[PDB]
Write an enzyme that holds these catalytic residues in place. Structure first.
Site, PDB file in Angstrom:
ATOM      1  N   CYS A 174       3.776   5.208   5.539  1.00  0.00           N
ATOM      2  CA  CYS A 174       3.986   3.973   6.296  1.00  0.00           C
ATOM      3  C   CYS A 174       5.463   3.565   6.277  1.00  0.00           C
ATOM      4  O   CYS A 174       6.159   3.839   5.293  1.00  0.00           O
ATOM      5  CB  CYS A 174       3.164   2.871   5.691  1.00  0.00           C
ATOM      6  SG  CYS A 174       3.155   1.408   6.673  1.00  0.00           S
ATOM      7  N   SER A 209      -5.575   5.462  10.067  1.00  0.00           N
ATOM      8  CA  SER A 209      -4.180   5.828   9.795  1.00  0.00           C
ATOM      9  C   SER A 209      -3.989   6.962   8.775  1.00  0.00           C
ATOM     10  O   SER A 209      -2.952   7.670   8.797  1.00  0.00           O
ATOM     11  CB  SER A 209      -3.415   4.625   9.356  1.00  0.00           C
ATOM     12  OG  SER A 209      -3.456   3.699  10.413  1.00  0.00           O
ATOM     13  N   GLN A 237      -6.967  -2.847  10.271  1.00  0.00           N
ATOM     14  CA  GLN A 237      -8.154  -2.016  10.416  1.00  0.00           C
ATOM     15  C   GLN A 237      -9.153  -2.372   9.331  1.00  0.00           C
ATOM     16  O   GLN A 237      -8.798  -2.606   8.155  1.00  0.00           O
ATOM     17  CB  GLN A 237      -7.796  -0.553  10.330  1.00  0.00           C
ATOM     18  CG  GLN A 237      -6.795  -0.149  11.343  1.00  0.00           C
ATOM     19  CD  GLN A 237      -6.559   1.329  11.262  1.00  0.00           C
ATOM     20  OE1 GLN A 237      -5.431   1.778  11.070  1.00  0.00           O
ATOM     21  NE2 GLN A 237      -7.641   2.102  11.361  1.00  0.00           N
ATOM     22  N   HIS A 264      -5.251   5.348   1.992  1.00  0.00           N
ATOM     23  CA  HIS A 264      -4.428   4.287   1.360  1.00  0.00           C
ATOM     24  C   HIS A 264      -4.712   4.090  -0.166  1.00  0.00           C
ATOM     25  O   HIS A 264      -5.878   4.213  -0.613  1.00  0.00           O
ATOM     26  CB  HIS A 264      -4.704   2.950   2.049  1.00  0.00           C
ATOM     27  CG  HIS A 264      -4.545   2.966   3.534  1.00  0.00           C
ATOM     28  ND1 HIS A 264      -3.491   2.354   4.175  1.00  0.00           N
ATOM     29  CD2 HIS A 264      -5.337   3.475   4.516  1.00  0.00           C
ATOM     30  CE1 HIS A 264      -3.633   2.480   5.486  1.00  0.00           C
ATOM     31  NE2 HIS A 264      -4.744   3.169   5.721  1.00  0.00           N
ATOM     32  N   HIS A 310       0.825  -1.201   0.000  1.00  0.00           N
ATOM     33  CA  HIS A 310       0.000   0.000   0.000  1.00  0.00           C
ATOM     34  C   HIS A 310       0.856   1.247   0.000  1.00  0.00           C
ATOM     35  O   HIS A 310       2.105   1.205   0.226  1.00  0.00           O
ATOM     36  CB  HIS A 310      -1.017  -0.049   1.156  1.00  0.00           C
ATOM     37  CG  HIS A 310      -0.445   0.325   2.471  1.00  0.00           C
ATOM     38  ND1 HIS A 310      -1.105   1.119   3.353  1.00  0.00           N
ATOM     39  CD2 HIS A 310       0.782   0.110   3.003  1.00  0.00           C
ATOM     40  CE1 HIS A 310      -0.333   1.351   4.400  1.00  0.00           C
ATOM     41  NE2 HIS A 310       0.808   0.724   4.214  1.00  0.00           N
TER      42      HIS A 310
HETATM   43  C1  LIG Z   1      -0.355   2.185  13.319  1.00  0.00           C
HETATM   44  N1  LIG Z   1      -0.606   3.656  13.125  1.00  0.00           N
HETATM   45  C2  LIG Z   1      -1.177   4.514  14.209  1.00  0.00           C
HETATM   46  C3  LIG Z   1      -2.591   3.943  14.549  1.00  0.00           C
HETATM   47  C4  LIG Z   1      -2.884   3.462  15.837  1.00  0.00           C
HETATM   48  C5  LIG Z   1      -4.156   2.928  16.136  1.00  0.00           C
HETATM   49  C6  LIG Z   1      -5.155   2.868  15.141  1.00  0.00           C
HETATM   50  C7  LIG Z   1      -4.860   3.347  13.863  1.00  0.00           C
HETATM   51  C8  LIG Z   1      -3.592   3.866  13.565  1.00  0.00           C
HETATM   52  C9  LIG Z   1      -0.312   4.219  11.928  1.00  0.00           C
HETATM   53  O1  LIG Z   1      -0.523   5.407  11.700  1.00  0.00           O
HETATM   54  C10 LIG Z   1       0.140   3.260  10.772  1.00  0.00           C
HETATM   55  N2  LIG Z   1      -0.766   2.428  10.224  1.00  0.00           N
HETATM   56  C11 LIG Z   1      -0.163   1.705   9.266  1.00  0.00           C
HETATM   57  C12 LIG Z   1      -0.856   0.750   8.541  1.00  0.00           C
HETATM   58  C13 LIG Z   1      -0.198  -0.224   7.806  1.00  0.00           C
HETATM   59  C14 LIG Z   1      -0.910  -1.190   7.087  1.00  0.00           C
HETATM   60  C15 LIG Z   1      -2.315  -1.181   7.137  1.00  0.00           C
HETATM   61  C16 LIG Z   1      -2.988  -0.221   7.898  1.00  0.00           C
HETATM   62 CL1  LIG Z   1      -4.737  -0.247   8.009  1.00  0.00          CL
HETATM   63  C17 LIG Z   1      -2.245   0.725   8.610  1.00  0.00           C
HETATM   64  N3  LIG Z   1       1.152   2.086   9.180  1.00  0.00           N
HETATM   65  C18 LIG Z   1       1.365   3.036  10.115  1.00  0.00           C
HETATM   66  C19 LIG Z   1       2.754   3.723  10.371  1.00  0.00           C
HETATM   67  O2  LIG Z   1       2.850   4.680  11.172  1.00  0.00           O
HETATM   68  O3  LIG Z   1       3.762   3.318   9.762  1.00  0.00           O
END
Ligand SMILES: CN(Cc1ccccc1)C(=O)c1[nH]c(-c2cccc(Cl)c2)nc1C(=O)O
Length: 146
Positions: free
Chosen positions: A96, A137, A114, A140, A42
């Site tokens: 990401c 997040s 998610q 995407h 992604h």
């Molecule tokens: C994990 N997160 C913070 C977060 C915490 C709780 C709920 C949603 C996002 C992110 O912003 C993030 N989310 C993702 C990610 C990767 C693959 C699929 C999805 Cl749905 C999110 N990458 C990141 C990153 O910072 O590299």
């Protein structure tokens, strides 16, 4: 039509197209043609209301959601035109950490991502790319690779 796909009429042309309300994909051509596991990459554009508005690219991400959506739209246009490829835009512009693997997230089953991302991922067929998918997040573009 396969899961999520619907028929519609274009504003500009009057030509029929097809839209997917799970993946936000849209195309002129018809699709007529569920696994336990998929593999996707992604490209994520974060914004000010992201759960974590920071990344390896920027300590503090301040762009609005609409601004992120405009970026995402620009990247989709270049990928579809063949002007850039997905992997190259992901390595360059994805908020990401998976940017470092050209956006590849590896294989995953339901219950892990998610939900809007999971649903979009499982509704794609191998090779297929989503439109803009919104999660907490950010926004995407998802390419299903397996
Ligand atoms: C994990 N997160 C913070 C977060 C915490 C709780 C709920 C949603 C996002 C992110 O912003 C993030 N989310 C993702 C990610 C990767 C693959 C699929 C999805 Cl749905 C999110 N990458 C990141 C990153 O910072 O590299």
């Amino acid at each position: 039509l396969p899961p999520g796909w619907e028929k519609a009429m274009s504003r500009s042309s009057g030509r029929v197209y097809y839209f997917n309300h799970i993946t936000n994909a849209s195309q002129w051509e018809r699709p007529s043609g569920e696994p336990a596991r998929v593999r996707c990459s992604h490209l994520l554009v974060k914004h000010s209301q992201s759960r974590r508005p920071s990344s390896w690219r920027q300590e503090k991400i301040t762009r609005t959601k609409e601004e992120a959506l405009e970026l995402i739209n620009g990247y989709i246009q270049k990928i579809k035109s063949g002007e850039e490829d997905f992997e190259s835009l992901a390595s360059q512009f994805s908020d990401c950490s998976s940017a470092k693997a050209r956006g590849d997230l590896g294989a995953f089953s339901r219950g892990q991502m998610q939900k809007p991302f999971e649903d979009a991922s499982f509704a794609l067929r191998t090779g297929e790319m989503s439109g803009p998918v919104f999660t907490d997040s950010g926004i995407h573009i998802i390419l299903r690779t397996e």
